[PDB]
Each structure stands twice: as structure tokens, then as C-alpha cells.
Design a binder for this molecule. Structure first.
Ligand SMILES: O=C(NCc1cc(CNC(=O)c2cccc(O)c2O)cc(CNC(=O)c2cccc(O)c2O)c1)c1cccc(O)c1O
Ligand SMILES: [Fe+3]
Length: 283
């Protein structure tokens, strides 16, 4: 018989505790697995390979495919007890994935970082480890707020992700923004308050926003269509006009560019990075 795992208003029947976990779409769950020492059966590949930072937990895994492109033939062959999917998949892709087994769309909304973590914990029987990781972050946070200067806290700060050579911004509770604005208390700017999903933003618009600090996240595996995007930007006269640029307050990949923002592991890293960068000295 199985157990009833409750996950964000929904309930799922899953035989737990299981090692037979297929992760597709949800890089969030990859990051949770990493801190929980969960070694899934299926894991997400990134350009066909498993990045160094995940190798400790991908040792018993085979690919479910690239992030946005689940391999149903592979996932069926695995016959998992649970498939951890993403809330970013179209519904028709979620229904198609669910032919291979019990499927839980894991939230990409960064304010659900605790629930996502506990879900994997509940599936794997590691609630103690998951509570300890969460508690530790909260202490890390309270301790880190004290180290961050007033000026920095009242500055205009942005997180951008460059994908296929375009600039994207995100809602207030998505990506790292829940840590930059929510946890550290910096004022989210209007364009971010207005964002309802991953939203394209022009350099032209950015130059009006004129942020004090810009965290730029850039992955080659997401920029194959234009690999010079970062260097071409830095040579654009509208980018060179930015306050953040001229004052040397642009931080490229302060956290690994495959980091998703809405996880314990993303939050702890961004919190330390933001702290180092905003206060201009290593903590
Ligand atoms: O099926 C998917 N996407 C269709 C889609 C494409 C788009 C247009 N997306 C892109 O061009 C894109 C390019 C490279 C990598 C991505 O993750 C992209 O979403 C938007 C959106 C809406 N997305 C968001 O709001 C979002 C928020 C935070 C982080 C994200 O990664 C988000 O996608 C959905 C998908 C599946 C797994 C993982 C994903 O990140 C996905 O975007
Ligand atoms: Fe996406």
C-alpha cells in the first residue's frame, strides 16, 4: 500500500519511501536532491551531460532528457514510483509525462521553496534533514541582514537572466527575487512588480530603470543561438550608459547560472553572493 503525500492543496498516492524518482523539468528538485543527498533514478541532463555540481547525486541516474524536453520512452523504461515534473510544462506535456507514472508538478514560484524541499523529503523519508536545512537558512538570513549596510538596502538592484541572447526579468516571488527583495528587504522595482512571468526586457528599457546593482546570470547551454551575447552587450553604448555598469556594480554569475533561485540551495548561495556584492567585501 502507498502513502498520501499532501503537496500544495493537492494529494498524491505514492509508495514511500522511494529511491525510484524520475526528475524532469524541475531543476528545483535537482537542487533539493543535492542538499538532501537523494540519488534519483531519473535526472535532468544539461547539453546531454550532468554538471559537476550534481555528480554526487547523479551517480545512479540516467537522463530523463533536457529540462524542457522529457524523454517519455526513457521515463517509461525506468518505471519510477514518482516523476517530479515542473509547473512550467504546458498541461499537454504534463498529461503526456503522466502516462509514465504518478506525476507531481513542482512549483517554480520561489516562495514555495520550503514545500518543494519537504515533498522530496517526504518521498525519501528525510524530513529531519529537510527541516534542519530550512532552519539553517533562516538563521543564515537573520545573521546576514545585520551585515548589510543601510545604503545597499535602499539601492536599486536587478537580477537578469540572458537566454538565447535576450534579457529576461522575473516576478517578485520568482527566481532569486524572493531572496533579493523578500528576504533582504530591498525595494523591488516597478518593472519587476509588473512582471507576471519570465518577461523579456529591452536594453533600452533597462537604461531608464538605471539600477545601482545588476546581477547578470548567463549560461552557454541556454545561449547556443548567440554565444557572444554577454560580450556584445558590454559593447552596447546603451548598456555602457547604465549606472551599474559605469560604477562597476555588475555581477556576472555570482551564483552558478543553472541555479533556479527558488530552492534552499539557490537561496543560501544567493544570500551570500548578494551580501558579498552589495557590501563590496567578502563576508
Ligand atoms: O515547458 C517549458 N516552458 C514553456 C515556456 C517558455 C517560455 C519562454 N522561455 C524561454 O525562452 C526559455 C529559454 C531557455 C530556458 C528556459 O527555461 C526558458 O523558459 C516561458 C514560459 C513561462 N515561464 C516562466 O515564467 C519561467 C519563470 C522562471 C524560470 C523559468 O525558466 C521560466 O520559464 C514557459 C519549461 C519546461 C521545463 C523547464 C522550464 O524552465 C520551462 O520553461
Ligand atoms: Fe523556463
Amino acid at each position: 500500500e502507498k502513502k498520501k503525500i499532501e503537496y500544495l492543496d493537492k494529494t498524491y498516492e505514492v509508495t514511500v519511501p522511494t529511491d525510484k524518482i524520475a526528475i524532469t523539468g524541475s531543476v528545483e528538485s535537482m537542487e533539493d536532491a543535492k542538499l538532501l543527498d537523494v540519488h534519483p533514478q531519473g535526472a535532468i541532463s544539461f547539453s546531454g551531460k550532468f554538471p559537476d555540481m550534481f555528480k554526487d547525486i547523479t551517480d545512479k541516474a540516467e537522463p530523463t532528457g533536457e529540462k524542457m524536453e522529457p524523454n517519455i520512452e526513457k521515463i517509461l523504461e525506468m518505471k519510477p514510483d514518482v516523476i517530479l515534473a515542473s509547473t512550467k510544462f504546458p498541461e499537454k506535456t504534463l498529461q503526456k509525462i503522466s502516462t509514465a507514472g504518478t506525476t507531481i508538478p513542482v512549483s517554480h514560484i520561489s516562495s514555495n521553496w520550503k514545500e518543494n524541499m519537504m515533498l522530496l523529503a517526504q518521498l525519501t523519508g528525510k524530513e529531519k534533514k529537510a527541516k534542519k536545512i530550512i532552519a539553517d537558512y533562516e538563521q543564515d538570513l537573520k545573521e546576514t541582514k545585520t551585515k548589510i549596510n543601510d545604503k545597499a538596502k535602499d539601492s536599486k538592484a536587478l537580477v537578469i537572466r540572458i537566454r538565447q541572447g535576450n534579457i529576461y526579468i522575473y516576478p517578485e516571488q520568482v527566481y532569486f527575487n524572493s531572496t533579493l527583495y523578500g528576504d533582504l528587504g530591498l525595494k523591488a522595482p516597478n518593472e519587476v512588480k509588473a512582471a507576471k512571468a519570465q518577461e523579456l526586457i529591452s536594453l533600452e528599457k533597462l537604461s531608464e530603470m538605471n539600477p545601482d546593482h545588476i546581477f547578470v546570470q548567463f549560461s552557454d547551454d541556454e545561449n547556443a543561438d548567440k554565444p557572444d551575447a554577454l560580450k556584445d552587450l558590454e559593447k552596447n553604448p546603451i548598456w555602457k550608459s547604465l549606472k551599474a555598469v559605469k560604477e562597476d556594480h555588475v555581477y556576472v554569475n555570482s551564483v552558478d547560472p543553472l541555479a533556479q533561485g527558488g530552492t534552499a540551495w539557490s537561496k543560501v548561495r544567493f544570500l551570500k553572493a548578494a551580501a558579498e556584492k552589495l557590501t563590496q567585501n567578502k563576508l
